[model samples]
Target: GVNAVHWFRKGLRLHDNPALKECIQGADTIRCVYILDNVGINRWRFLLQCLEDLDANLRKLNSRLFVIRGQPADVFPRLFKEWNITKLSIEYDSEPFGKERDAAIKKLATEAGVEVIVRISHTLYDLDKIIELNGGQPPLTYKRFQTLVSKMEPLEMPADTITSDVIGKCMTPLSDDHDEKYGVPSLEELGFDTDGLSSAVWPGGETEALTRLERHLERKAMNANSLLASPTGLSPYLRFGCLSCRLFYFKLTDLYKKVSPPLSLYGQLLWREFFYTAATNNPRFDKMEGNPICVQIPWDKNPEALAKWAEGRTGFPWIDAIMTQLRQEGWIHHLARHAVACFLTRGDLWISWEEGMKVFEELLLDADWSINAGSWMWLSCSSFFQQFCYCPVGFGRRTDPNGDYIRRYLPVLRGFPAKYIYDPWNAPEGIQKVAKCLIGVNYPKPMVNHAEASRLNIERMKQIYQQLS
Candidate 1:
């Protein structure tokens, strides 16, 4: 009759959760826990929804989730004593901050003489192993990463989900005051405004994630061209770990046996793994300074310009629309992400990619520390990529020819014709009058001349690279 606690972090789902499975073995008492953390309103709402779904699932198994409030180091010590925990299980966390926090907790658990079990379930492969395979350094290029992984053993299969029989073996001890002490807090409790909050475009938790995966597989044709098509809307789920990467990998491969195996889908997942591998050993992966892989450039400190881009007031309808979608919905397409990231960094404004990364970290539901920072560097030509710049207007126009995506997000310019939609500022005053949306009045004028700014910025980047040489 041992007391055990299973700490939930990124791997929020119960299915394929090896740590939770481990926590239940030979335990008479068990507890599942999640930490409350912030982000934007939409992200917070999505997370709350995830917690609600997790609680509901746990209740079905005669158990419940304990959502504690406080830092792990402070909270876990109290929890270990309160529950008289004899064993602790957690899914491995590879990010710099997570690793640091977990290490401290491991030390605390050891001092208390509690047995700890750490499982690798959040990622497809052990990120440390990838680095080890690369001769003590992360592969600098995606091709190099692919080559390194090709020589390794196959990815681990997903573990079994929790079942009633499994729960029947353990007791989730609860007190009468459990709801008051450990229940999921509302948005209002967290100091978020709930008024006029729209329903989630992408709801959280494993139940919704599995349903979406089924629907996606049924309509897999839309995913054929990853570049031109809209996103599969699965990123947020993946980000929150509502969907297991191994489960997703196996699902796609199994489908491929029936049907490229859609290398597009596989490639995207590997890209996530690539970033995780690249970042595991680099403490400064999320920062510009002291990050060995990052190229140092004298990026401008233009808060006004950065705010304009972040708030979707850039006057470039395409960029503005994408930003608007991101703010309202907590998600955006990958191509749209590139267009905005480029506009904020090297393409238009000479702002540092770090500023753009912060904005995304606040807003993007799918924003991961490694992927977000890596992408900002790549899009800004600061690392791992070069020889390209995303033309904010043209790229948007090419992908969304009818300006329907623009019209959907930027309703203020809905009246303008498609010809004038992308470049509303260029339209004559007469067209503006007819459309009832005057540029720089109802909406906004294009912030910077993309043509002029991009050319000069390219020259600046060239000089910086020369200085590096």
Candidate 2:
């Protein structure tokens, strides 16, 4: 009988893995495992792709991934009975559903005389260090939090060294056919509302993540600052632990040093942690009235217009570009994601931030609850981002990269060529014929004039924040 079998649910990697390491240290032999059940989170496509890759990676290392379908509580008991397993070890996932599920499994495993051990080394910042520095209080401002952390003992990142090359191989392979019948629906599956359009973006998982990262570091990232100052796809990697945020910080350390480590992108990582902690500490995050002062906002519940935005047919270059990027690539650059979101929620004065919240959850591969909820609140002149407004950034986007980014994604503007990519309608009549995406024919034309959206966007946000003042 084997000593134990280790499983990977959200904790995908074999590297820096405390659970797998514990099983290896304590047991005579070990098997690596994964459960393909996305019962709690309905991400069937991503689940399938991730399982397939895990299987491949295991095979490369001469180890195998054992996938089980159904509730893990039932599956674990069945595996324990079959293998005469004495112990179970796994990384603890912090999500709401994962926490409850693990507790149920621990009780069952204990009754069967199997010792269930848990480990938590995923996050870069130690919760204890952060708490001690902050006087156990979450800071009200970014500077205060940064100042608190600056006083702490300098942190060290954990590194792993592998001594053994040989690992046990899987005798049987797992298929994505965990359930043939059905799963949940995403935006594309449900199809369009007012605008008959759809957004198909990047695929999920580690390999794809590595590809985007390498490409950015090598080619696209060269001019990224000039164009995508906010950058895209960074979140998806953070979402799945495909790459470490600390690793990303160190990589960009030389690139962005002295510019403001704790205030800019590096600090953005802390924002993620803050949101996560906030959610853990507060229950009303999902249904938050936003910042108290900002809540009295007269949000218009316009489903038809909202549907057009959701479908990525908003037509304003700034809105269309950012919205389309999210739909097609499962990503939008950091600056644009925030800017356009502000445009929709704050500028329009009609749409709820909640709608943008829903779109993010669907489209963002790395969508964290804290980030999703926190960022929306922050941008809406509510929480963290209330200090200032960044709405006008979108209006100036036409001059960005001379409109190359816009011409790349939006097919309706494809006819405008390099010259007028940003303002496609400005192309000559002959050029329009050559680039003939008739404003309303090839695309829905501008949903809201950029000037109007930006002007209204700033004024509305100013009024909202004034309520707080």
Candidate 3:
């Protein structure tokens, strides 16, 4: 009987997992493997938890997750030769770094005389297919990509259950000596601090992800705009492939059967595909340096300005609140993301989105490289979006009318009156003392003159727009 290794990168779950399903059916003996790399600490912690969950789940089926450390190029050749791996199977990832890593592994596998089988299961459509459908270029707009992909056939339905007999053969044995390579790593082993992660936030793994999905369906069914209210919280799981995107998509489709398919919440899934293709096609997707689509403005190189923005000391209660949420909780509302991203870029500080993107990459548990860069691009009006006029500062008007989000995250402003919470600097001296949060003392005053800063940013954008034209 031939033995094979299932290279579990993104597709982590057994149910609704195409790569796992294919591996079971193709090979008589199977070994599951995961590689851990030095991404940021928050992401690293979340991934460790994900692997622990998978390791526990796999143990029930008489299999174990082979946790390896180091780059794919350095790991695969040795593993193949030692374990007698005849075939290498992986789910396709089109993001630039993943594409490069997979190419290297495939080359090594070829040299070692191992056949490689790759499957498309990450996004709703193989984003590469969507790119090819649009004349070999990624669709410049989300709507265009949606329109093109809408014509393609639907993705495969989630697999019902992993056959019990499938794990009957080839139980991948563990090594006591190679504890670092075989076991789920600890925070100290991975050199990550537990500063951001907490029990208050959602846990990683398929179990928790599915639990959130069930609650999400119930809430979204009653309230169509229930996105901000008790969201599925499946993003981190999806980002790491701890949850299958196809399974989640189809489950939503089946739940909202009566609702028009276009109006369904699957638009988020399409948005995921949009950025995946964008990141794959554009080498300069993450930076402002050489990206032609990104408008060239003489952005402020003020490290102090960026430091305040990142530390949630921006003085705008709403912006500070969201940044606090991001740093502490490792996630924030999408609207909150927009507020901070805008405030950093064209809204107030006039900083580069690359700087903001890097901060997000460090702290965001759910951060996918493509989505982080693509969203920064959109929020900065560098590409794929152009409505650069609205400044998303302040609270008590739009989404956060009661100033509740502010008080929860920024406790110094908890005593400040609602009328003045969004504009605390304008509060009278007596009022500031009464609120116990004096402007520029405990909490920061507004970092920049909002009106003048916005005017200058608008003028600079106009000049860049003319240049682009």
TM-score of each: 0.96, 0.75, 0.92
Better of 1 and 2 by TM-score: 1
Candidate 3, which segments miss by more than 4 Å at Cα?
26-28, 38-40, 174-181, 195-197, 222-231, 258-260, 263-265, 385-387, 390-397
Q: 335-413 in candidate 3: lDDT tens per residue?
A: 6677688889988888999999999998887778999999998988888856564454533236666677778878888
Write down the lDDT of every candidate, Cα atoms only. Answer: 0.85, 0.61, 0.77
Predict model 1's lDDT versus the native. Answer: 0.85
The whole-model C-alpha lDDT of candidate 2 against the native structure comes to 0.61
At residue 140, what lDDT does model 2 achieve? Answer: 53
Ranking by TM-score: 1, 3, 2
RMSD of each: 2.2, 6.0, 2.7
Top of the candidates by TM-score: 1
* Model 1 C-alpha lDDT per residue in residues 1-469, reported as the tens digit of each score: 5999998888888899998898898999989999764278888887888888999999888789999989888888898898899899999999988899899999999998889999998788888888988889888799898887678797777888998876666888878888899999899998888797777777888888889888888787312133222334588889888999899899888888887343466886889989888888889998888999999988999889989999999999989988998988888778778889888988899999999999998899899988998889888888885645678778877777778888888898888888888999878999889889998899988999999999999899889888877
Tell me the tens digit of each residue's lDDT in model 2 across 95-180. Answer: 54566788898999999999887876455565545655777645656677667666665545433422253233322223465223
